Amino acid sequence: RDQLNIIVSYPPTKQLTYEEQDLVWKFRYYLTNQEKALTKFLKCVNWDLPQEAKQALELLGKWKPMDVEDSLELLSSHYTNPTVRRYAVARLRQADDEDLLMYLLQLVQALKYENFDDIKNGLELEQDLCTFLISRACKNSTLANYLYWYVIVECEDQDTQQRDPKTHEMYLNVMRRFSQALLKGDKSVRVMRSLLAAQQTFVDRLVHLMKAVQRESGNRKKKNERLQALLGDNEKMNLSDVELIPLPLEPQVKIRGIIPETATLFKSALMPAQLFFKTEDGGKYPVIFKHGDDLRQDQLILQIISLMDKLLRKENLDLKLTPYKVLATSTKHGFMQFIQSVPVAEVLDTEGSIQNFFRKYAPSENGPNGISAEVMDTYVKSCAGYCVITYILGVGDRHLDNLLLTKTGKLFHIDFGYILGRDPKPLPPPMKLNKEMVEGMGGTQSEQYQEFRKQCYTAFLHLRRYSNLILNLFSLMVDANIPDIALEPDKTVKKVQDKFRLDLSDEEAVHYMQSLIDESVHALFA
Numbered sequence: 287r288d289q290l291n292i293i294v295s296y297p298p299t300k301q302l303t304y305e306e307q308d309l310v311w312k313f314r315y316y317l318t319n320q321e322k323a324l325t326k327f328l329k330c331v332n333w334d335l336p337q338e339a340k341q342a343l344e345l346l347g348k349w350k351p352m353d354v355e356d357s358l359e360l361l362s363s364h365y366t367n368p369t370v371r372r373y374a375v376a377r378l379r380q381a382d383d384e385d386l387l388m389y390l391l392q393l394v395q396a397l398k399y400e401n402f403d404d405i406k407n408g409l410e411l412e413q414d415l416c417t418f419l420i421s422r423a424c425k426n427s428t429l430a431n432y433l434y435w436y437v438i439v440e441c442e443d444q445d446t447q448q449r450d451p452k453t454h455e456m457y458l459n460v461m462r463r464f465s466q467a468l469l470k471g472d473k474s475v476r477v478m479r480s481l482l483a484a485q486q487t488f489v490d491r492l493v494h495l496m497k498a499v500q501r502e503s504g505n506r507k508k509k510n511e512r513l514q515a516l517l518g519d520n521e522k523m524n525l526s527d528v529e530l531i532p533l534p535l536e537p538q539v540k541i542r543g544i545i546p547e548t549a550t551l552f553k554s555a556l557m558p559a560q561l562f563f564k565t566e567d568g569g570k571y572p573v574i575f576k577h578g579d580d581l582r583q584d585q586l587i588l589q590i591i592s593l594m595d596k597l598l599r600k601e602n603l604d605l606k607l608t609p610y611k612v613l614a615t616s617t618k619h620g621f622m623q624f625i626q627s628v629p630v631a632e633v634l635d636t637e638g639s640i641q642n643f644f645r646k647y648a649p650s651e652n653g654p655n656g657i658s659a660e661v662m663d664t665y666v667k668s669c670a671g672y673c674v675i676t677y678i679l680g681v682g683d684r685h686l687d688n689l690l691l692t693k694t695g696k697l698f699h700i701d702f703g704y705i706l707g708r709d710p711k712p713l714p715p716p717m718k719l720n721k722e723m724v725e726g727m728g729g730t731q732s733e734q735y736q737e738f739r740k741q742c743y744t745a746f747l748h749l750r751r752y753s754n755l756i757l758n759l760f761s762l763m764v765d766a767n768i769p770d771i772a773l774e775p776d777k778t779v780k781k782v783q784d785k786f787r788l789d790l791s792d793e794e795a796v797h798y799m800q801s802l803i804d805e806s807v808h809a810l811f812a
């Protein structure tokens with residue numbers, strides 16, 4: 287009946303009532319070939335009663351196997367049954383590394399829901415999350431790299447060390463188990479350990495270099511010259527000439543070192559560094575090296591933006607997004623991929639507007655407002671894409687210093703210090719959209735505006751379809767040391783859930799999205 291289809295449609299986090307539980311339970315045998323009924327059914331099971339547990343796992347066997355997207359729910363805190371947890375890993379094994387990599391950050395966090403004793407006893411349908419992740423890491427260099435940096439930061443975490451010494455020791459063990467597996471492997475596998483160790487030394491030497499620059503009082507010019515001098519002496523610092531190691535930030539990129547003479551410090555409180563990595567093929571890879579600050583909140587947000595971009599691209603909707611790489615190398619430092627762009631604040635300061643800026647660096651006679659057709663389409667798509675993504679992620683503290691623009695027309699957001707409905711000012715707008723963006727398209731009477739609205743609807747409807755995956759991924763982050771999560775862990779997933787408005791139809795959703803843009807665009811006139 288229809289009452290069953292309304293119950294299975296529920297978000298992964300929607301808590302079923304006792305009345306709703308005993309209903310799914312009664313009709314369990316009639317739901318066995320319904321893929322999206324299994325999670326709802328496993329919720330209903332009295333995992334304490336042996337006869338119920340027994341019949342439930344019998345049903346788990348004969349049940350239509352679930353999607354990887356839905357399987358992520360089985361790895362959360364709500365599940366403790368070892369069979370249900372091995373089943374979750376068994377479905378997760380069906381995913382390819384490309385997908386697995388998209389979920390890895392949350393999978394490292396999901397280890398704190400695993401059996402700590404099994405992880406320990408492994409030192410010196412049958413695989414747990416630890417064995418599975420190490421297994422996959424041994425076969426894929428990229429995966430091994432992120433499993434290393436994700437676990438090392440959780441080991442380093444001093445807040446976990448004191449608050450949960452049990453979880454801290456579990457991660458030390460995950461690292462020991464990983465190191466053990468690497469040494470028991472093939473020629474290819476055994477060299478991954480020395481590669482991870484070489485990058486760890488590299489980062490340690492870079493951390494020391496940043497400190498060597500700050501030991502003094504000096505002009506930014508003098509500090510820049512102190513950075514350049516220290517990077518130049520490869521005999522002492524060994525940072526300008528290294529055996530081609532993976533770049534922790536993007537391991538597919540193999541680096542020779544940092545170019546000494548082009549390295550500088552940013553005009554910013556913690557003076558992060560701009561460093562150019564010499565890649566194996568003579569190319570340059572610019573990075574931001576941030577010290578004395580925690581990148582984990584940005585690292586999560588950029589990981590979700592990347593996922594959202596891949597999902598949209600999958601549905602043949604490339605909205606020209608900039609999911610720049612963010613990697614924390616400690617709870618105190620890390621890397622960000624430097625993107626050549628200009629903050630919108632500076633766009634207004636130097637050129638007066640986004641339109642002027644575009645007319646200057648990308649003109650064309652009969653193009654929209656004398657601007658390149660390609661640059662304008664890129665701008666409309668990226669605006670729409672970010673308007674929707676920042677709306678869902680509840681990104682606050684939006685100002686024109688953390689809104690960046692490229693000369694190719696790419697608009698994007700940076701610095702995700704405020705997320706999930708948090709903002710320095712009270713009553714913040716739900717739709718993160720300003721008059722500078724709107725004026726960039728050519729105002730509300732422009733064909734570009736209608737196109738922007740259209741792209742906002744398309745993105746929303748496609749992202750709404752992946753609500754199960756996104757909410758499951760957030761549910762694995764509830765107990766992570768992410769400031770804006772740690773504030774209200776118990777309320778985190780619902781904050782994301784409510785933005786999808788999964789209560790509304792596709793037609794109803796586009797009207798709500800349509801009204802939200804209007805209510806925001808008319809609020810810009812007060």
Ligand SMILES: CC(C)(O)CNc1ncc(-c2ccnc(Nc3ccncc3)n2)c(CC2CC2)n1
Pocket residue numbers: 552554558574576579610622623624625626627628629690700701
């Ligand atoms: C580091 C922080 C004080 O915590 C703020 N957070 C943050 N987050 C991301 C970026 C970033 C990321 C990627 N590309 C660029 N490019 C550009 C291109 C041109 N002018 C600016 C940025 N900037 C940045 C900006 C760099 C530090 C100056 N800051």
Ligand code: NA
Pocket residue numbers: 607608609610
């Ligand atoms: Na990008």
